[PDB]
Paper text:
To understand how ferlins are organized prior to membrane recruitment and to clarify which conformational rearrangements accompany their membrane binding, we obtained additional cryo-EM structures of [name]+-bound soluble [name] (residues 1–1997) and the closely related dysferlin (residues 1–2017), at overall resolutions of ~3.2 Å and ~3.5 Å, respectively. In the lipid-free state, both ferlins adopt a generally similar ring-like structure, formed by only six C2 domains. The rigid Fercore module is well resolved and has a similar organization in both ferlin structures, including the C2C, C2CD-FerA, and C2D domains. At the same time, like in the lipid-bound state, the anchor loop of C2E wraps around C2F, ~40 Å away from C2E’s β-sheets. As a result of these multiple contacts, the C2F domain appears surrounded on three sides by C2B, C2E, and the poorly resolved and dynamic C2G domain. For example, C2E’s contact interfaces with C2B (~252 Å2), C2D (~347 Å2) and C2F (~235 Å2, excluding the anchor loop) are equally small. Likewise, in the lipid-free state, the C2B-C2F interface involves a relatively small number of residues (~193 Å2) and is not present in all the imaged particles. Finally, the C2G domain, which is flexible in the lipid-free states, binds the reconfigured C2B-C2F interface on both sides to close the [name] ring.
Ferlins are ancient membrane proteins with a unique architecture, and play central roles in crucial processes that involve [name]+-dependent vesicle fusion. Ferlins, such as dysferlin (FER1L1), [name] ([name]), and otoferlin (FER1L2), form an ancient group of C2 domain [name]+-sensing proteins present in almost all eukaryotic lineages. In contrast, the N-terminal C2B and the C-terminal C2F-C2G domains cycle between alternative conformations and, in response to [name]+, close the ferlin ring, promoting tight interaction with the target membrane.
Author numbering: 198 to 384, 390 to 467, 493 to 915, 1047 to 1095, 1126 to 1401, 1448 to 1508, 1514 to 1779
Amino acid sequence: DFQIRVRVIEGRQLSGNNIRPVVKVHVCGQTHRTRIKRGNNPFFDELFFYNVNMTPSELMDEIISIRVYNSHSLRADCLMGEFKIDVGFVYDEPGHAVMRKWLLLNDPEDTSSGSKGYMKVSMFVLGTGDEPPPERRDRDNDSDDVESNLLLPAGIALRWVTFLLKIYRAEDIPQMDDAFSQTVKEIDKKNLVDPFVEVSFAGKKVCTNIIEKNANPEWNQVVNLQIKFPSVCEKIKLTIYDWDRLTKNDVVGTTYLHLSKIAASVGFVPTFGPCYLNLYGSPREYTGFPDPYDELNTGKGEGVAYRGRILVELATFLEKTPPDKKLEPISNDDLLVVEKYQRRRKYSLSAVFHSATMLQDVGEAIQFEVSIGNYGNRFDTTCKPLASTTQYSRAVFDGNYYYYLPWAHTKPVVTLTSYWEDISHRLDAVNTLLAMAERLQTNIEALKSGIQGKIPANQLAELWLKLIDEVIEDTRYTLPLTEGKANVTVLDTQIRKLRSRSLSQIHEAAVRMRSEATDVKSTLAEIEDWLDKLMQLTEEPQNSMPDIIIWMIRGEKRLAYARIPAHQVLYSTSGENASGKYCGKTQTIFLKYPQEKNNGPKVPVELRVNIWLGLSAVEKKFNSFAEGTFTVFAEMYENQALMFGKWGTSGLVGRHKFSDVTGKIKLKREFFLPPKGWEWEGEWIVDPDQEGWEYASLIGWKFHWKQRSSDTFRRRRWRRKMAPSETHGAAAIFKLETPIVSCNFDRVYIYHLRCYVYQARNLLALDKDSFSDPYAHICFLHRSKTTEIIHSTLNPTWDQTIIFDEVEIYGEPQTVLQNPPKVIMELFDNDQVGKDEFLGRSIFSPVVKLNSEMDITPKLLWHPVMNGDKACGDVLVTAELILRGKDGSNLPILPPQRAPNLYMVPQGIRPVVQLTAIEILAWGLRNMKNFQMASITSPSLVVECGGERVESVVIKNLKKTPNFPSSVLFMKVFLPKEELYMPPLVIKVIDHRQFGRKPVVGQCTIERLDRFREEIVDWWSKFYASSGEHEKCGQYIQKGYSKLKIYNCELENVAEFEGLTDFSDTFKLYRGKSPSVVGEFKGSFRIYPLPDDPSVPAPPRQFRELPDSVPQECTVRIYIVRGLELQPQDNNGLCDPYIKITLGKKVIEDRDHYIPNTLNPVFGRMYELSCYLPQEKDLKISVYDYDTFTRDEKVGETIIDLENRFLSRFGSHCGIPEEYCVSGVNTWRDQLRPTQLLQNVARFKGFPQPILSEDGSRIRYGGRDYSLDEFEANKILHQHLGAPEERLALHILRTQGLVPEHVETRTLHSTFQPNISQGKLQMWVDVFPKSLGPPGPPFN
Ligand SMILES: [Ca+2]
Ligand SMILES: [Ca+2]
Ligand SMILES: [Ca+2]
Ligand SMILES: [Ca+2]
Ligand SMILES: [Ca+2]
Ligand SMILES: [Ca+2]
């Protein structure tokens, strides 16, 4: 057996606009398909498996078709085409795998003009039982470096285009040298780097000229690339290196030149610029030891510090094909036209720090630093040093687990002045369509909560009208006037034309949606990719504003970072929507460690900041955004010394009488005066010994509160406030060009928060017993609490409300209503020995309720619990964050207490549970796989549903008796009525192996728990009589014989007998961690409501008629009638078919009764076997092909599971006749008489026993009375008829649904086509247990 593995990963630049791509995968005739995605660039990560049993000389002949289609709402999928490749190519590859290779899409004739898309494809062909070399991860480093399958027939792309990438200059490049060559002259440190740009695209690398010792270089060069005009590679890797002779060239930073943000399928050649592109990487401070964060320099990771920026412009000639003229200087007219794109404007930044919580370290002082680009870097040397950093703060303990900062009403303020290009003509568009995208996403989630919650139809209709009218209103946003702005690029005009086209298209289709349709459920498919169209309109290659990187410094060591993209904080005069989302508004920001892509086990700090950025020509209107009152304190001091036992101001050598805090620099009260926009407030007062004297042991040393024995020097304090005087206002803090500025809040607001932590699911097992002991640290700003520990559970139910009182948060309540701070839950595994282990983190926002009219009861939601990178479980939590009014009167009623100071989740927020009886018919396990290459001998079954546990009796010998002695199990579980909150059912299988081990050899998951609430009078004559094929009314039919029924499909496909699976519903098991087939457990579940009183015992069982559950030896008799339309297997164009049967240890090969040269073989043959049931349940019937000289080919095969035939409630073990007869061809072969079968089916159906009459003429059964004269009226009777009671009871058995005699017609399947009809044939099978005695006479 050979195996084909196919994986689809990604699609990029698929042709056509407004497309909904989907991929159909076909391997060797077996065809499936993927899901439907949105947009131009879908991501799939779908995997499919296939198996064929071809010869090794025939395996390479088949092809792999990965054909792609364009899905439509009202039409069928339209073919796009694909480059199919044979199996010989992937088998010819080293390792037998073309692995993560790209693939082309093609029109079969129009592929010469360009490809129709690209699809990332993984191939592997290997034998069965083998394993692959490992594959994982998502990355974009390998693209278009001949990874795409080249030389497809007549479909090579246009490799004639030349990328005219002009590079102009660069600025602010950080120091990448040790500066030893310059500091020996004792002097210039900011300009020592040797930048060159390694351009890289599709595996082609050209290096530009070197400029030595210039952090503001001027290249003015043209670099030429020769690529295909359709190219899968999305971005050019612009990576500035530092050139060095004695060592490998270090990496300054990496930015990317994205093309498909401009492209339309209407479209043009790739263009860009002239626009600056910002680099990011390691912190700018050079170290003599090699840099630990050098991985972030090469683009791996998002970068933690700004590393300069570079002005480039991309043009494209469809000509010039340059082999050797790869580097030419820029002509001078492009040099004076590029000065219009370098025009600087002054910018102003202010950051008010609101909170900095969830700290774990308490040792040594903390601070923060706000820097944009190079401005604000506290380690860079510059004249007039900026107030770019907050003051030092010492964290205090919140009482329970974490630490917070004592900032309280006095918030730190960081103010700095920068110089950037006025690219606000672009970022106005970026911010406005991002506001469109966020409004559309919020309204989409409103529609999603409407359709999931089943709101009334008028509410859903007015919500959808609000959606459509929102797009109607603000899609009329005119793009900014790109004339008179000197920095407008050619890409700006092309992108503006494309955006106007797309915006007018979605606008007119929004009028169409408003005027043609009312179907709110069909139109959301087009809204959901209108949202993706807005995503494709927002994002930019030309963002030259560097990110506001806001750091955390522990002493002098940089510890944690974040970066805000500066477009959502930039202010502009064009409008509020054209301004940023977080412009002048608070935001919750989780800082990360530098090497961490996302925060892992420990968040360093939950920093909350309010950053405003904008042009300094329009910084006058800070006063609309401003909150509180900005305040600066002027400083001077006075030193005294204890000489001759008395304090005095004289004798201060090295200091002054009036001076600064260290005493070294002389100061006076009027040395610093309030500048323009400022006036003095109040008067110089002592700010505290109650006199204010602070004493130290040495001169200019650390002062403290009171004079000890060793203190011989002292000082004291005076401060004077300065406040904004005129209507210059709070904007005057930019005019302080530095004294420490802080924002004073004159009003405090009280907040009361309740977190409803009900339950979790799918938590990791960090203990040795494959469970955990979870608990949660619920932290919110300057408070935290700890929940209870639920021991030995991976699906815990804490059922606990965590309550915080007196959480003081400043600012207006509308500020916290628009931007609530995050409630963070840190789940841990409680270990009684050692430190607890990190389980995960859930971040969600509380529903802020400022007053009584916002009293929405908060629904619990399954917020993800991220650990590392991936989600590792969910928690069902919510929160509410309320204005605490006067005396807490508007606060809700407290939740009840099951324990002292330990609250429960209250009645309206908890999942509404009702008590159910989950009854499990745990019967048997079939088709086991070896655990660690060792057979299974002693399995047992454990049923779990939301933490409730029941166990079954362990099987002593699986090979001998694979059936549980405990057939019926009970669980009494409070299950939620809502489908969302209701937990999945998990089954465990435990094998009694050596060493007293408890291993899991199989696990099962179930989610659809809503389900379980004259002639010779032979058989050829009777077959023709029932079929009506021959004579159709004749004298044989006029003898009144029993008539069978011919079914053209399977009995399993007959919905009348429920597929013969009702008593034995089959399920699917798994093993290990990412998997494949290990086993199958079957047995019917019955999940029905228990009575509402928990003390009341069980209701009567739904499983009350357990049969003989031990295995029984059974005699089988297989009848084969005729095959139809078989596939030829010979050189003569026909087939010579025969029968091959295997029942476990017994094999029958029906060789010498073959039928020559037919495709319709009338077999008419009788095969008798006897085998152990239900162990050998797999009855395999196959048709093979006679050849007198060659190997027998396989025509087809079908699998019949006889235990489902024997154990069915419909009794398909023996096909009953129409009327009861004792001799001839109609002889009763069943070992149980019709009346005993009637009482048996009364037992299995739960029906009462049949009340026979005194002569058998009347039988009462199943709530209905039956009579013999109803069937015997105008019915011909003949001499084989037996007793009248059995005769009548047989007609009851025929009218009640017990299976009569049939000739079924099964489907053949080959190994090449396991689901396609490889012919047809007719069978009917008889099963008789030997426990009920010997069966009747066999039939010919
Ligand atoms: Ca270097
Ligand atoms: Ca260098
Ligand atoms: Ca543990
Ligand atoms: Ca533990
Ligand atoms: Ca043959
Ligand atoms: Ca043959």
